[PDB]
Amino acid sequence: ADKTLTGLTVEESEELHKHVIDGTRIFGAIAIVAHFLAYVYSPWLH
Amino acid sequence: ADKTLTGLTVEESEELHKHVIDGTRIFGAIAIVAHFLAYVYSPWLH
Amino acid sequence: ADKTLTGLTVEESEELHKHVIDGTRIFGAIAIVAHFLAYVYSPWLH
Amino acid sequence: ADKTLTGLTVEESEELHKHVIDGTRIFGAIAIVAHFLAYVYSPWLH
Amino acid sequence: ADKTLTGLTVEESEELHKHVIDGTRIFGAIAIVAHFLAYVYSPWLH
Amino acid sequence: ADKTLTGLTVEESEELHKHVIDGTRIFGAIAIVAHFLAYVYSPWLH
Amino acid sequence: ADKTLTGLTVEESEELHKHVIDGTRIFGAIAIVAHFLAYVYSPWLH
Amino acid sequence: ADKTLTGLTVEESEELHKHVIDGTRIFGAIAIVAHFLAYVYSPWLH
Amino acid sequence: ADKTLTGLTVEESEELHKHVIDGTRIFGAIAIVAHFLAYVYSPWLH
Amino acid sequence: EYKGHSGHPLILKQEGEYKGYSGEPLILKQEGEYKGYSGTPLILEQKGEYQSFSGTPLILKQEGEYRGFSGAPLILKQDGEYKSFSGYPLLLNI
Amino acid sequence: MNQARIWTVVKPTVGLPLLLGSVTVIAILVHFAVLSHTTWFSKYWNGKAA
Amino acid sequence: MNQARIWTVVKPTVGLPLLLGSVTVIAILVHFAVLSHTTWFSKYWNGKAA
Amino acid sequence: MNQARIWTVVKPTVGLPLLLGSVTVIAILVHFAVLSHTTWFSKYWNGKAA
Amino acid sequence: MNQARIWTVVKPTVGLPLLLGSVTVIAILVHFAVLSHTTWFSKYWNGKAA
Amino acid sequence: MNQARIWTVVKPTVGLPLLLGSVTVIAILVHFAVLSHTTWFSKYWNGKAA
Amino acid sequence: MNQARIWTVVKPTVGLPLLLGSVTVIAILVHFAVLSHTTWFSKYWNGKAA
Amino acid sequence: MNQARIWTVVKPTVGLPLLLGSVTVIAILVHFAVLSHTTWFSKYWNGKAA
Amino acid sequence: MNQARIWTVVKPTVGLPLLLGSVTVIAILVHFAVLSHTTWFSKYWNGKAA
Amino acid sequence: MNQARIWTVVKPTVGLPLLLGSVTVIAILVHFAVLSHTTWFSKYWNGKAA
Ligand code: BCL
Ligand code: BCL
Ligand code: BCL
Ligand code: BCL
Ligand code: BCL
Ligand SMILES: CC(C)=CCC/C(C)=C/C=C/C(C)=C/C=C/C(C)=C/C=C/C=C(C)/C=C/C=C(C)/C=C/C=C(\C)CCCC(C)(C)O
Ligand SMILES: CC(C)=CCC/C(C)=C/C=C/C(C)=C/C=C/C(C)=C/C=C/C=C(C)/C=C/C=C(C)/C=C/C=C(\C)CCCC(C)(C)O
Ligand SMILES: CC(C)=CCC/C(C)=C/C=C/C(C)=C/C=C/C(C)=C/C=C/C=C(C)/C=C/C=C(C)/C=C/C=C(\C)CCCC(C)(C)O
Ligand SMILES: CC(C)=CCC/C(C)=C/C=C/C(C)=C/C=C/C(C)=C/C=C/C=C(C)/C=C/C=C(C)/C=C/C=C(\C)CCCC(C)(C)O
Ligand SMILES: CC(C)=CCC/C(C)=C/C=C/C(C)=C/C=C/C(C)=C/C=C/C=C(C)/C=C/C=C(C)/C=C/C=C(\C)CCCC(C)(C)O
Ligand SMILES: CC(C)=CCC/C(C)=C/C=C/C(C)=C/C=C/C(C)=C/C=C/C=C(C)/C=C/C=C(C)/C=C/C=C(\C)CCCC(C)(C)O
Ligand SMILES: CC(C)=CCC/C(C)=C/C=C/C(C)=C/C=C/C(C)=C/C=C/C=C(C)/C=C/C=C(C)/C=C/C=C(\C)CCCC(C)(C)O
């Protein structure tokens, strides 16, 4: 290997990004539920 | 084992996160009580 | 080649910019669809 | 024991935190007196 | 040659400025067209 | 003894604090007089 | 000669300032024209 | 004697503070005159 | 003579301050003129 | 290679002089001393004591030993220990 | 899912705090927007308006 | 609970102050929001309003 | 597509966060602008005005 | 009381000034909030209003 | 076109972000200025005002 | 008086300016608060109101 | 024209960006000032007010 | 006159500029305060109000 | 004229930018103050109001 600017290897950067992708998916799924609840109970889109 | 960017070992990072998780649970528990008190005394959700 | 101010080689800088260009094109593609939907549903340009 | 990220040993960190805990207790105690005085002289909770 | 304050040689600084001048000229051309459209459609200069 | 995080010895840190305590007491004394004059001349507490 | 706080020699400093003086004079000239145009077309000084 | 945290000796610091003290006395005397003038001409304290 | 905190010797600092003093005196002279012009043309002090 | 999703090329591939899009020249070289487009001269030399325009003196010299225009004393003596003005005890550490 | 090597060039101790902070600031701003520009969100908090 | 290794890439002296500070700022913002967009919260502090 | 070498002189850990951050800030500002100077955008959120 | 080791990972010259400063800022914000959203606090300072 | 040597004394990682950022900030400020000081710009966004 | 050792962990060049500065900011804020929420303070500065 | 040695004590990468930025800020401020405190500047942009 | 040793622990290039700057900021604030909460200060600048 | 040695303890690349910047900021503030608290300054820019 050779030094990246940050010092994370390509593999360590990919393992870090798995958490970032999974975090975005979890945030999205919760936000989808929050939008469904906001639709169900607010006058939005009614 | 290998050196990390922050200097903490994986074992030290997991120990630190236990305090973060415990603190988040304590904060959540107190927040739940505060919402219950607010619901009882304020006109919200009535 | 020679060392640069940021430490990235010319090849590394070019491979990085490919993500920036592709990201800009993806952002533009989504933004175009957003403008089309905005037009189809909002009173803008009507 | 080994060098910490901040340089303080476990004993020094614990001795430092004692002042933080005592300080929070002193602040809390004075705040309770201030709330009592406020309750007595202000129309709050009346 | 001698070490510059930024580390870029005079030759490298000139090639960088070529992109800055080109960028300014491109930005100016797009801006000119945008101003022409504003004149044609907005009540400005009417 | 060992080098503190700030480089000040215990004796130096305590001798510094003596100015902070004295300075706080002097500030308090002036502030008390300022409040007395405010009471005597303003409509506060009347 | 001797080292300077900025690492820029006296000759390089005087040559740098030439661009600053010329830039100020060019800014002043354009500004003078802008004020003349503003006077001719706006109600200012009328 | 030992190297201070700032590098100034006790003597150099005391000579520096003389300018701070004198500067404060100069500022204070000027401000006193400004208050006398503001009193004589403004409706304050009248 | 010894290395100062900033690196400027006593002679270099005194020479720099001459430009600061002359710069202030020039700013003052220009400001005095601007005040006279403002007085002659504005209703201030009239 | 970065495959992308938005078609190809993603970057331009030529080498040498930057063939900028907005005609040429892109810059003006200098063979030597900068000449102002606002003409000349640009600089006034310093060759000794700084020439004021605002008369002289420009500074008041101090002999490594200041004495103020508010006279004296400017500081209090301080030896053996700090002297408090607000009485004692002054610390109560453990 | 193709950007994974960004952490070879953006410091994680910078990009992750800025990512989580920015997402949170956006969420706060969207709440304050809907709160300022609807009647019903304020009304939901006011409830019976005791 | 699975993000425990974040402290190997994000400095604790940075993430922990930012986390505790952000939670505090969010709490303050929610209080000010409800305080401005409701009547009962202001009424609670005003009490008898004598 | 010809500026690809900009990353040899501008640090990626600086330019990329500033780029992604600015693009996000611009989008936020454009939303607030349209929200503050139009009626239909607020009307869309208010819906039935329940 | 179980967080005593936080000072081994958070610099005291950072966490302590931020802690003391945050507490003071919160106190100031609470005073300004009550002062703005209540009548009696302002009336207390006015007193006789002479 | 004669200032090309500026990058020998001003760091590209500083001057380039400040240049591109300032130009963008100015464009935003101009749009907000025209939007808040004219009637036709807001009317253009409202369109039919439905 | 028992906190005398805080300067062993908090840098004097940081804590001393931040202390004196914060104290001054509080004093400024208290003067502005009383000035904004009272009549007699403004009345004192107007005096004869000439 | 006699201050040419300022760059020997003030770093060019500091003073030059601050100079150009400050001049641009001053210009922006003067435009906003005249735009707010005059009628004709707004009228010029509004034109026929179509 | 007894604090003279503060410069042995507080960096002059930090505290001394911050002192002069703070004193100036305070003076500016006091002018703006009296200008906003009085009539005679504004009246003095208007003079004859020509 | 007796403070000439200030530059031995205050860095010129800090004190000189702060001095020139502060004096400029002060001038901007004084212009905005007189502009906001007078009629004739606005009238001068408005002229005939044509
Ligand atoms: C969803 C569709 C994909 C897409 C898929 C393709 C395909 C497929 C091809 C290219 C190819 C090209 N792409 Mg691409 N590309 C997109 C976005 C862009 C954008 C942009 C939005 O700014 C740009 C400037 C480019 C640039 C380019 C050129 C380098 C090249 C030749 C132009 C062409 O005919 O394209 C295709 C042109 C059009 C489809 C006409 C409209 C073009 C405009 C400028 C953008 C339309 C975006 C659209 C609204 C996104 C949503 C579409 C819906 C999914 C239906 N792409 C999006 C992300 N691109 C070519 C290539 O490199 O082949 C090897 C090619 O054949
Ligand atoms: C889009 C066209 C290109 C362009 C293409 C050319 C061409 C072609 C030539 C030059 C050449 C020159 N260019 Mg160029 N150049 C542009 C932008 C600029 C700008 C600027 C906008 O401020 C400047 C100052 C310059 C500077 C110069 C001089 C060094 C030189 C002589 C002037 C000239 O011929 O102008 C030409 C420009 C005009 C007379 C007016 C341009 C009007 C508009 C803005 C552009 C043309 C219409 C276009 C279809 C509109 C769409 C723009 C897109 C939205 C980007 N370029 C843009 C980005 N440039 C010459 C050269 O080097 O020859 C060897 C030359 O013949
Ligand atoms: C031409 C205007 C020049 C100027 C040119 C001179 C000259 C010439 C001399 C001095 C000398 C002196 N100057 Mg000088 N000086 C100016 C500004 C100043 C200011 C200030 C504005 O606060 C101060 C405090 C000083 C300080 C001093 C003393 C160190 C010294 C002795 C006083 C004396 O004899 O005064 C005499 C009277 C004055 C200096 C005039 C004071 C009135 C001010 C300047 C009026 C406003 C501006 C005026 C209308 C001119 C137009 C300015 C342009 C628009 C920029 N100068 C400006 C920058 N100065 C003298 C010296 O060294 O003696 C040994 C001397 O011979
Ligand atoms: C003259 C005003 C001086 C002062 C001069 C002295 C003197 C003289 C003595 C002390 C001593 C003491 N001072 Mg002291 N001190 C002042 C301000 C303070 C303040 C404060 C919040 O203002 C505090 C908490 C203290 C603390 C203390 C105690 C450690 C101690 C008394 C113990 C005791 O029996 O306690 C119970 C009694 C008290 C806590 C009362 C302490 C004094 C009060 C608070 C002073 C009020 C000042 C008044 C408002 C304004 C003065 C005018 C100008 C503003 C300067 N000082 C001011 C700056 N102090 C005494 C000691 O024990 O020394 C061995 C002693 O002899
Ligand atoms: C009409 C006049 C106005 C008014 C106008 C002003 C103005 C204007 C100002 C003040 C200022 C102050 N006012 Mg007042 N003030 C009013 C009425 C009040 C009321 C009230 C409930 O009515 C209170 C509580 C106060 C109290 C105070 C202080 C908070 C503050 C001076 C600080 C000081 O002395 O620091 C020095 C510190 C001390 C004296 C404490 C040390 C000595 C003590 C005795 C020792 C024990 C310390 C203790 C154990 C430590 C606690 C540890 C905790 C863990 C933190 N005023 C009235 C309504 N007041 C000033 C200010 O803001 O200063 C910052 C200010 O400028
Ligand atoms: C708001 C209201 C109502 C009222 C406010 C009123 C008010 C107070 C207004 C105040 C206004 C003021 C103060 C305006 C001041 C304006 C000024 C001063 C403008 C200056 C412009 C300077 C320029 C353009 C400099 C360009 C420099 C350049 C290009 C430098 C290039 C350097 C190079 C190439 C390096 C060479 C390296 C090597 C030597 C090795 O070759
Ligand atoms: C306010 C009003 C009314 C009006 C204001 C109007 C106004 C002015 C509007 C202006 C709008 C503007 C200007 C909009 C501009 C938008 C732009 C430019 C969008 C750009 C998007 C870019 C993206 C998405 C980049 C992604 C990069 C990525 C993901 C990079 C990934 C990098 C990696 C993986 C490292 C690889 C390392 C290796 C492996 C090579 O070593
Ligand atoms: C205002 C108005 C009206 C309108 C405005 C409208 C508008 C513009 C809205 C815009 C909204 C936007 C843009 C929203 C975007 C949202 C996004 C993108 C959310 C992303 C969430 C990401 C998460 C949750 C990441 C968690 C990462 C995690 C936990 C990472 C963990 C890492 C670890 C453990 C280290 C590993 C160490 C090792 C293994 C290597 O050793
Ligand atoms: C306020 C109101 C109402 C009204 C008044 C408002 C007001 C006053 C407005 C004033 C507006 C002004 C002043 C506008 C000025 C605009 C300007 C100047 C725009 C300039 C654009 C420049 C660009 C786009 C540069 C791109 C550079 C780039 C991409 C550089 C890339 C470099 C590379 C790849 C080389 C590195 C690799 C190696 C060579 C080493 O190999
Ligand atoms: C708020 C309301 C309504 C009202 C109240 C507002 C209020 C309170 C206002 C207060 C205002 C105040 C306080 C104003 C103060 C103004 C002053 C002090 C101005 C000073 C100007 C100084 C200048 C121009 C200096 C130029 C220096 C220069 C050019 C230096 C050059 C140096 C060089 C060449 C290096 C040489 C290196 C080597 C020696 C080695 O050769
Ligand atoms: C806004 C509304 C409506 C309501 C808000 C209400 C509200 C919340 C108010 C809160 C107010 C608060 C909290 C006020 C607190 C005030 C305090 C704590 C004041 C402290 C003053 C301290 C001083 C003066 C220290 C001087 C130190 C000094 C001079 C140190 C000198 C050091 C030296 C010489 C170095 C020696 C080195 C060597 C020994 C080696 O030689
Ligand atoms: C908002 C409302 C309504 C109300 C608000 C009310 C309110 C809170 C008001 C508060 C006001 C306050 C707090 C005011 C405080 C004012 C003070 C403290 C002024 C101090 C002035 C200090 C000066 C002038 C220092 C000059 C230093 C100098 C010249 C130093 C020179 C140094 C040298 C030569 C170094 C080389 C030397 C070597 C020996 C080494 O060679």
Author numbering:
A (entry chain B), B (entry chain D), C (entry chain R), D (entry chain F), E (entry chain P), F (entry chain H), ...: 2 to 47
J (entry chain S): 4 to 97
K (entry chain A), L (entry chain C), M (entry chain Q), N (entry chain E), O (entry chain O), P (entry chain G), ...: 1 to 50
How is this structure described in the published paper?
LH2 complexes are oligomers of a basic α/β-apoprotein dimer, each of which binds noncovalently three molecules of bacteriochlorophyll a (BChl a) and one or two molecules of carotenoids. Light energy absorbed by LH2 is rapidly and efficiently transferred via LH1 to the reaction centers, where it is trapped in the primary charge separation reactions. Overall, the cryo-EM maps and the corresponding models of the four LH2 complexes are very similar, all with a ring-like structure in which nine α/β-heterodimers oligomerize to form a nonameric complex. The most unusual structural feature of these four LH2 complexes is the hitherto unknown γ-polypeptide, which partially encircles the LH2 complex toward its cytoplasmic side.
The protein–protein and protein–pigment interactions in the PucA-LH2 are very similar to other standard B800 to B850 LH2 complexes, except for the existence of the γ-polypeptide. Both α- and β-apoproteins in the PucA-LH2 have a single transmembrane helix. The β-apoprotein of PucA-LH2 has a loop on its N terminus, which protrudes from the membrane. The pair of B850 BChls is coordinated by α-His-36 and β-His-40 through their central Mg2+ ions. The orientations of the bacteriochlorin rings are fixed by H bonds between the C-31 carbonyl group of α-B850 and α-Trp-45 (2.9 Å) and between the C-31 carbonyl group of β-B850 and α-Tyr-44 from the neighboring α + 1–apoprotein (2.8 Å). The average distance measured from Mg2+ to Mg2+ within the subunit is 9.5 Å. The average Mg2+ to Mg2+ distance between neighboring dimer subunits is 9.0 Å. Each of the nine monomer BChls sits between two β-polypeptides near the cytoplasmic side of the complex, with its central Mg2+ liganded by α-Cxm 1, as also seen for the LH2 complexes from Rbl. acidophilus and Rba. sphaeroides. The bacteriochlorin ring is tilted by 12° relative to the membrane plane, an orientation fixed by an H bond between its C-131 keto group and α-Arg-26 (3.0 Å). The B850 pairs in PucA-LH2, PucB-LH2, and PucE-LH2 from Rps. palustris have H-bond patterns similar to that in the LH2 from Rbl. acidophilus 10050.
